[PDB]
């Protein structure tokens, strides 16, 4: 599983085994840095504007 995030503030779960993404999730500030958390939880984080 991978993730891809657009200029339109959209986050995208590219499962390598698929051509259609899994969870077309959606949030402001998705242009900026995203990351998988170094925990067992699949925690996501976006960060701009001291937020």
């Amino acid at each position: 599983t991978f993730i891809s995030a657009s200029a339109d503030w959209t986050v995208r779960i590219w499962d390598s085994k698929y051509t259609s993404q899994i969870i077309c999730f959606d949030l402001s500030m998705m242009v900026v840095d995203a990351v998988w958390a170094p925990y067992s939880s699949t925690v996501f984080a976006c960060a701009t504007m001291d937020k």
Binding site: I13, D15, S20, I23, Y39, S41, T42
Partner: peptide, 29 residues
């Protein structure tokens, strides 16, 4: 630190969670 880990659902239920995300796709359809 309180938001460190939940330690039960994150670990071995995570593959089930990805299957559940694929289920949410079947739901989208």
């Amino acid at each position: 630190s309180p938001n460190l880990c939940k330690s039960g659902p994150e670990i071995k239920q995570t593959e089930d969670k990805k299957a559940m995300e694929e289920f949410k796709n079947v739901k989208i359809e």
